[PDB]
Design a protein around this ligand. Structure first.
Ligand SMILES: NC(=O)C1=CN([C@@H]2O[C@H](COP(=O)(O)OP(=O)(O)OC[C@H]3O[C@@H](n4cnc5c(N)ncnc54)[C@H](OP(=O)(O)O)[C@@H]3O)[C@@H](O)[C@H]2O)C=CC1
Ligand code: SF4
Ligand code: SF4
Ligand SMILES: [Zn+2]
Lengths: 176, 291, 111, 373, 126, 208, 114, 95, 95, 48
């Protein structure tokens, strides 16, 4: 089925040609466009004041790159390197010593916020849900030094909130 | 010694060279091009600026990711200097203005500043303290600038005596003082900026050339008036204290070596003047060569 | 008919004799080529069956709905293109046997 | 700035002789980077070669891999994929119209329809969470299904947007001066439209009837009903109007897709292609092993070459896959309608002046992301 | 059709445009990759791969990354024979090292022969 | 074998089989292979001589129109004496069927200005020439598209690494943009994910 | 076996085409180096041009020399137009040291450079 | 909860702290070495050792399909008692 | 709402599509969040007692492509029968 | 939180001054907010 456009000519009836000539010589449909944009003048504007009203989001937004931990416990990461194995921009750098008490751990867990493309493949891939995208998007960094995160930056970033990520993981242990 | 002072691989742009240079001032001309040669070497420039963040912003991406570091300092205190040279390999002293101000003049900068920073550098354990001086700065008359730099040479020889006193000639480059002074309107040997700063970086990375003072020579050494002829042939703040400084003394000092003894090849005035002398509108190369 | 849909293709008023002279020239220029290839058999079969579909049909709409590859003058265009290949395929020797084989270790895929 | 391109025109004045569109300015090495990466880890490269078709490129890549891998995806996956395909088609046509307007002058309809585009970005936010690059279409059906409280919101949007697009045709569309600006220019002979490799909206405008959705239904497009508009002359006025009535047909397809939606299943039930769900992962063993080595090793793909294409709103967006029997794609290559349209720039603008040349660049949806490959 | 050429060596090395340091300084190595002997699976055999020699890797002094001045230190080329390996390696103009495809020993060991009467082939445990 | 499996439809397999046999009969001269894949698109493997007669035949002939041209890439593999593959792709507007005409070549043998028979092939030919170096003979105008001008090396080859050899920055000595040998900050940790045990036993090549 | 030749028949027309191409680069240098206003003498530019011709002198095939004729022809066309800017024309040189002499000992001090 | 270096500043959970012959102290001029103020090794012995009167027991991480996947651990020794590799918390059997 | 009657008549007059009804400033149409927790269906798997993977052996169906070549007749068929010419769509045709 | 205007103008913070030795009567920041109100304010939930 094809419903095509413009197979029609302006018919040569005298009223048709004088109405089209009145459109020409009297600018009528132009003034109709003026009336359209004035109808949008008198509307109420659809803006939001930013620094007092932040914009809406989802529970499934992808944010901040924090490390979590157990409920009053140890670091939920294990250094199992999956997040580097699926990180497409390869911004994850992991080096893993085992600690003193026999359990396996890290030395160095680094993200390049310059390099990260914010997919959450590490979110879909961390087998214990340690590294989780956060809610917020406010870095605005003055330096190119600060945008290379280390393990203590990520753990302090996880210290800056849990109850947010608690509500998000409670909203997303069902779909993902 | 401890690691990471060893260099690695090639040089420049995350090719780690083995020197850590604490450079004073350098928001002006010659310190900026020296920072550029150190970033081309791929080193760690510790620079204190005492200014607005905008000028050090315009020199900021010269070095690599985090190899530069910026910090405050001043010409009056000492704790900021010691906080600057906490962990330094080498340090070069380049500070000095051609005009007097309200709070700071030619005196007590060349008389105060190298004493204190040389003192705390000798305390905090640096090597290769390189202090600049003007060429032929003596106790000769009509030049407060030259006599203050001569007293500065005497003081740098005094405290931390194993210091590299250098004396480059009247430099010309991309942002020259006196050439641009000619743009808005007795032999003399000027020497181009990259010869000087290549000599500086070669003398800072080629040890056994340390403690012995070095002098730079312009490879023309002709009259001022023929140079005015050439610069207006190619080009179609005015205090006369400067004009006494540029008329007073122009001679050689054979008491010490120069360019080709250091490992650095000179470049004459003509080619570099073809480089920098733009602004014809919106070649007559004379070079009469007086001795 | 009135002002067909495609832009550069102006309308036609003589379908019949145009297609007849085009297909007779098809059969002649194919008559230059010997039957040493099966190409002559295939092209002769399709062209004569198409022309013999056209002959015993006088109509216009039935001539379009019966003769495939519509609508009307695109068939004429395509036939002119086939006569262009007929002229170009006197030359170039498509019927000749093969040019030399590859080194033959090639076309299995998984390298 | 008048995308970003080098234009080297040569002219008799207020007029023309001939030009050279130099592009390569936005070259990124995408094919080489895919030659070193795996399938899943390089799906975002297809998501952001073109950036407007944030789901149609996903659908084309996923059908390339599913066509190579012998997997028929489940029905609810197909319907969600078709729904997001029509939505992204709507967003792509509305960008083409509005950046044509902002190129021509014409300030205010850009901002009306970018309010609309902010709402549809908000629907992508609720679905994946990403603002724009919702990658989200894993090969083997769509992962992470749409949450509760969405479809009636799409229904509300559908009503209000049909009103807003009627109002947009009120604003533009038989205006005296926009017709006066662009009717005379850009005629394309349909025979030359076939031979110059023009595809998509160009074949809509010049004559000949063609649409991949009507010809080769690669998905559940056969079970929904619409009618594609055709242009009557080569005049880009017709091309513009064809884009508008394709938008209105996109609204019809979304209406029927909300009408006949089955509550079947998210993904395929083939754990050797897609990762398992998180509950069976954290409980049982084979799900964990498939999870772990599926993300690391990457699922093997049988060797062979394939080619596919969809009607992206530019045109026949094609991908050619070459796979050594491995976990990497060996070489992929992209048929870009933007590149093919950019080739015929001299033949669109051989006898017209430079402001209309910029109007001819604007009347075809170039982005110069996809035009680079 | 029986045109110009005579069989000479090939000179693509002037056509690739890489500088002379990487023309002549490095040396290739052509081998079948050994079976990853913590596993025993022989699918990763049967391809003649080309690699290059290595150079230094220093610490990134800011993050502790492996940074290097080595563009070609991420190469491997998978082949199916040795003649074409040598032909391509000299066709691009560099020296090279060829190794052996060391096949496993052909054995014939069996259960009853492990369970003999007098012989010392006696597993003593199963 | 029925649910969640993309079904074949062997009627189209038979129709394209008969068409391929038709093509092999009517052009006996330049045909080495006419293969049909199970997902039913035609592939025809071609000696690099009669490519222009093949295209002038398969643009026309009223039994198979194929006006529609698509991708061309000479997908580079080593291990063969002829490294490169010109992969023409064609679709008929009238017939809804996709054929691929793959002819072979090595690093010096050209094709002979195929732009004169498909007008879309102009920037495609110039693209393949710039990215690979596969010279195309008697073409009207060859230039460089999709590279830098000062760049050279034909980067889509396998010998060209993932990074390059030149790298730009801005130096303040001569106050311009200059190039350097490339100096990474991270390794690009290359992974060997070639795990054994033969996930596809249908394609087992024979040994010596 | 045999090869379809590209342009020439033996090494002689290859030498003739490259000769003519060098004539074209000779008449290309001074007008363009005035037009872009670089900082290099015409002697230095021409001598590094003929140095670049000295770089590939030992090539023994007609095909490769024809392909270099194509290379130099394309580069000469896009420099005789005003496309390739000051950056690329200066990028033909080396104003980034790289001073490294071929002394064994000077390469031995800062090492791992065989 | 940090120790103190021979330089005097804060060491981390890993003993990585610098020396006087370094210079990343001089890149720490005026900006904080952001140390973790809550070490994980110190937060293991603080937990109550659960003493389950079964033999071989499960471990999840406190919540179905959250935390780590299940692991079933043995409790046969009486001097080197139980420890999950994931949960990192001890177990005994006490009748 | 929050507008007087005169400008309400202006917004109805200056564009006759009744702005008061459908105005894209939604007030309480916005859905309540915190949905009750869902379950998820599984289609043609997890049904026990039969579900052999070799039955739905999807991947291993990759046959190699069948080849015809290296090196009276009711024939000369097209690759497909001719595609049917389309229809004037009854939902407002033209014309 | 209003229940009268449209969506996105439901909810708003109003910041105060001098909260970390800052004198922030002027120049208010993003993320001066505690995280539970950051959950509330983006309408990730309809509940305070
Ligand atoms: N003929 C000549 O004058 C020649 C001079 N030189 C030397 O080059 C060096 C650099 O000078 P140049 O590049 O020409 O330009 P500048 O005069 O701008 O460099 C001097 C630097 O020291 C800073 N400075 C000056 N006075 C003070 C002060 N009282 N307190 C703190 N900082 C101060 C300057 O300003 P700020 O802090 O605002 O950045 C600037 O950064 C000088 O030491 C000069 O002796 C070398 C060759 C020739
Ligand atoms: S995937 Fe998770 S547990 Fe594994 S290394 Fe990454 S953050 Fe750690
Ligand atoms: S979000 Fe993507 S790019 Fe970022 S760390 Fe995770 S996988 Fe890597
Ligand atoms: Zn546990």
């Amino acid at each position: 089925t094809y419903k095509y456009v413009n197979l029609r000519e302006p018919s040569m009836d005298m009223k048709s040609v004088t109405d089209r000539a009145a459109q020409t010589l009297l600018w009528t449909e132009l003034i109709r466009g003026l009336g359209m944009t004035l109808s949008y003048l008198f509307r109420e504007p659809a803006t939001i004041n930013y620094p007092f009203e932040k914009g809406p989001l989802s529970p499934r937004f992808r944010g901040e790159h924090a490390l979590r931990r157990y409920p009053s416990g140890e670091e939920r990461c294990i250094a199992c390197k999956l997040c580097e194995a699926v990180c497409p921009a390869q911004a994850i750098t992991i080096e893993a010593e085992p600690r003193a008490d026999g359990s396996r751990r890290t030395t160095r867990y680094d993200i390049d916020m310059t390099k990260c493309i914010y997919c959450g493949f590490c979110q879909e891939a961390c087998p214990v849900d340690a590294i989780v995208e956060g809610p917020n998007f406010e870095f605005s960094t003055e330096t190119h030094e600060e945008l290379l995160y280390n393990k203590e930056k990520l753990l302090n970033n996880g210290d800056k909130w849990e109850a947010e990520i608690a509500a998000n993981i409670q909203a997303d242990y069902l779909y993902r | 010694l401890h690691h990471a002072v060893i260099p690695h691989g090639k040089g420049g742009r995350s090719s780690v060279s083995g020197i850590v240079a604490t450079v004073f001032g350098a928001t002006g001309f010659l310190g900026r091009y020296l920072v550029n040669h150190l970033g081309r070497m791929g080193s760690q420039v510790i620079v204190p600026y005492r200014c607005e963040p905008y000028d050090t912003m315009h020199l900021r991406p010269m070095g690599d990711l985090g190899q530069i570091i910026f910090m405050d300092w001043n010409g009056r205190d000492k704790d900021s200097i010691r906080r600057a040279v906490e962990h330094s390999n080498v340090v070069i002293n380049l500070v000095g203005r051609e005009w007097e101000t309200k709070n700071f003049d030619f005196e007590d900068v060349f008389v105060k500043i190298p004493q204190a920073i040389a003192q705390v550098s000798k305390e905090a354990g640096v090597e290769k303290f390189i202090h600049i001086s003007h060429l032929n700065a003596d106790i000769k008359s009509s030049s407060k600038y030259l006599r203050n730099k001569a007293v500065g040479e005497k003081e740098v020889r005094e405290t931390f005596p194993e210091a590299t006193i250098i004396k480059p000639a009247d430099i010309f480059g991309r942002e020259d003082r006196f050439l641009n002074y000619f743009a808005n309107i007795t032999v003399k040997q000027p020497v181009y900026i990259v010869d000087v700063t290549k000599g500086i970086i070669n003398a800072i990375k080629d040890p056994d050339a340390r403690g012995k003072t070095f002098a730079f020579v312009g490879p023309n050494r002709y009259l001022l008036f023929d140079l005015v002829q050439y610069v207006f042939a190619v080009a179609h703040w005015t205090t006369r204290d400067k004009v006494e400084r540029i008329h007073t003394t122009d001679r050689t000092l054979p008491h010490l070596p120069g360019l080709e003894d250091l490992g650095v090849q000179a470049t004459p005035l003509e080619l570099k003047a073809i480089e920098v002398l733009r602004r014809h509108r919106t070649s007559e190369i004379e070079d009469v060569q007086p001795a | 008919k009135k002002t067909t849909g495609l832009v550069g293709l102006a309308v036609c008023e003589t379908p019949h004799e145009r297609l007849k002279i085009l297909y007779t020239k098809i059969l002649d220029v194919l008559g230059h080529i010997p039957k040493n290839a099966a190409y002559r058999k295939y092209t002769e079969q399709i062209t004569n069956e198409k022309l013999s579909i056209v002959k015993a049909e006088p109509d216009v709409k039935k001539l379009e709905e019966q003769l495939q590859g519509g609508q009307i003058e695109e068939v004429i265009l395509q036939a002119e293109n086939e006569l262009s290949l007929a002229r170009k395929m006197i030359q170039w020797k498509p019927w000749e046997p093969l040019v030399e084989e590859p080194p033959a270790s090639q076309w299995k895929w998984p390298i | 700035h008048p995308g970003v391109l080098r234009l080297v025109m040569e002219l008799s004045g207020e007029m023309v002789r001939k030009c050279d569109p130099h592009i390569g300015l936005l070259h990124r090495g995408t094919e080489k980077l895919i030659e070193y990466k795996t399938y899943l880890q390089a799906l975002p490269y297809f998501d952001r070669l073109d950036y407007v078709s944030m789901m149609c490129n996903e659908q084309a890549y996923s059908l390339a891999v599913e066509k190579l891998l012998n997997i028929q995806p489940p029905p609810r996956a197909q319907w969600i994929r078709v729904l997001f395909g029509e939505i992204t088609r709507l967003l792509n046509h509305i960008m083409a119209v509005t950046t044509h307007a902002l190129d021509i002058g014409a300030m205010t309809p850009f901002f009306w329809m970018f309010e609309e585009r902010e709402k549809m970005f908000e629907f992508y936010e609720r679905v994946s969470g990403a603002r724009m690059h919702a990658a989200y279409v894993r090969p083997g059906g769509v992962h992470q299904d749409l949450p509760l409280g969405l479809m009636d919101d799409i229904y509300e949007f559908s009503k209000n947007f049909s009103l807003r697009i009627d109002e947009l045709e009120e604003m533009l569309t038989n205006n005296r001066i926009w017709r006066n600006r662009t009717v005379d220019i850009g005629v394309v002979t349909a025979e030359d439209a076939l031979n110059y490799g023009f595809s998509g909206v160009m074949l809509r405008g010049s004559g000949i009837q063609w649409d991949l959705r009507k010809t080769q239904p690669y998905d559940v497009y056969d079970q929904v009903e619409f009618d594609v508009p055709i242009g009557s002359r080569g005049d880009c006025y017709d091309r513009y109007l064809c884009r508008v009535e394709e938008m209105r047909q996109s609204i019809r397809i979304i209406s029927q897709c909300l009408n006949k939606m089955p509550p079947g299943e998210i993904k395929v039930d083939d754990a050797k292609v897609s990762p398992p769900k998180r509950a069976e992962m954290k409980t049982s063993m084979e799900s964990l092993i498939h999870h772990f080595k599926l993300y690391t090793e990457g699922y093997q793909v049988p060797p062979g070459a394939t080619y596919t294409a969809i009607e992206a709103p530019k045109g026949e967006f094609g991908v050619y896959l070459v796979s050594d029997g491995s976990s990497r794609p060996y070489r992929c290559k992209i048929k870009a309608p933007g590149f093919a349209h950019l080739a015929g720039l001299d033949k669109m603008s051989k006898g017209h002046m430079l402001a209309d040349v910029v109007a001819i660049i604007g009347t075809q949806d170039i982005v110069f992301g996809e035009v680079d490959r | 059709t029986q045109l110009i050429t005579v069989d000479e060596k090939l000179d693509i090395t002037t056509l690739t445009g890489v500088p002379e340091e990487h023309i002549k300084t490095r040396k290739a190595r052509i081998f079948v990759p050994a079976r990853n002997n913590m596993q025993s699976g022989v699918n990763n055999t049967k391809k003649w791969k080309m690699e290059f020699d290595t150079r230094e890797r220093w610490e990134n002094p800011l993050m502790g990354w492996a940074s290097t001045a080595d563009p070609l230190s991420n190469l491997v080329l998978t082949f199916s024979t040795k003649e074409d390996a040598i032909a391509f390696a000299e066709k691009n103009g560099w020296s090279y090292d060829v190794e052996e495809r060391k096949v496993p020993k052909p054995k014939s060991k069996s259960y009853g022969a492990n369970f003999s009467w007098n012989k010392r082939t006696r597993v003593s445990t199963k | 074998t029925r649910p969640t499996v993309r079904p074949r439809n062997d009627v189209a397999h038979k129709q394209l089989s008969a068409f391929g046999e038709y093509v092999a009969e009517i052009l006996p001269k330049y045909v080495q292979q006419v293969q049909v894949s199970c997902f039913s698109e035609l592939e025809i493997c071609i000696h690099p001589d009669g490519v222009i007669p093949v295209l002038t035949f398969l643009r026309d002939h009223s039994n198979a129109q194929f006006k529609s041209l698509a991708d061309l890439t000479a997908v580079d593999i080593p291990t063969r004496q002829n490294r490169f593959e010109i992969v023409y792709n064609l679709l008929s507007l009238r017939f809804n069927s996709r054929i691929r005409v793959k002819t072979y070549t090595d690093e010096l043998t050209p094709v002979e200005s195929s732009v004169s028979v498909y007008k879309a092939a102009n920037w495609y030919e110039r693209e393949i020439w710039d990215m690979f170096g596969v010279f195309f003979a008697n073409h009207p105008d060859l230039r460089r598209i999709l590279t830098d001008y000062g760049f050279e090396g034909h980067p889509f080859r396998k010998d060209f690494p993932l990074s390059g050899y030149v790298e730009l920055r801005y130096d303040d000595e001569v106050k311009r943009v200059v190039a350097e040998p490339v100096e990474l900050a991270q390794e690009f940790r290359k992974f060997d994910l070639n795990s054994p045990w033969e996930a596809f036993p249908a394609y087992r090549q024979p040994p010596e | 076996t045999s090869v379809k030749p590209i342009f020439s028949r033996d090494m002689n027309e290859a030498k003739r085409r490259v000769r003519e191409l060098y004539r074209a680069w000779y008449r290309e240098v001074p007008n363009t180096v005035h037009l872009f206003q670089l900082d290099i003498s015409v002697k230095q530019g021409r001598d590094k041009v003929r140095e670049m011709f000295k770089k590939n002198a030992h090539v023994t095939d007609p095909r490769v020399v024809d392909l270099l004729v194509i290379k130099g022809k394309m580069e000469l066309e896009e420099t005789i137009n005003v496309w390739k800017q000051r950056t690329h024309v200066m990028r033909f040189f080396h104003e980034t040291e790289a001073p490294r002499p071929k002394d064994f000992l000077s390469k031995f001090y800062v090492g791992h450079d065989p | 909860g940090v120790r103190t270096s021979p330089t005097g500043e804060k060491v981390t959970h890993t003993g990585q702290v610098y020396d006087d012959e370094d210079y990343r102290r001089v890149r720490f001029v005026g900006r904080q070495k952001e140390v973790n103020e809550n070490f994980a090794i110190d937060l293991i012995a603080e937990q109550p050792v659960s003493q389950v009167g079964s033999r071989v027991i499960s471990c999840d991480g406190g919540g179905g399909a959250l935390g780590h996947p299940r692991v079933y651990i043995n409790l046969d020794k009486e001097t080197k008692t139980g420890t999950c590799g994931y949960c990192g918390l001890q177990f005994r059997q006490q009748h | 709402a929050s507008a007087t009657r005169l400008i309400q008549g202006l917004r109805n007059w200056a564009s006759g599509r009744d702005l008061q009804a459908k105005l894209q400033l939604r007030y309480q149409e916005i859905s309540k969040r915190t949905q009750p927790p869902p379950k998820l269906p599984v289609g043609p798997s997890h049904r026990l007692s039969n579900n052999y993977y070799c039955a739905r052996d999807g991947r291993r169906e990759a046959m190699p492509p069948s080849i015809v070549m290296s090196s009276s007749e009711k024939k000369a068929v097209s690759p497909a029968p001719p595609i049917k010419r389309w229809e004037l769509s009854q939902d407002e045709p033209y014309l | 939180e209003d229940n009268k205007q449209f969506f996105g103008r439901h909810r708003w913070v109003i910041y105060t001054t001098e909260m970390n030795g800052k004198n922030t009567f002027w120049d208010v920041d993003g993320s001066m907010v505690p995280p539970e109100w950051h959950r509330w304010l983006h309408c990730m939930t309809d509940d305070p």
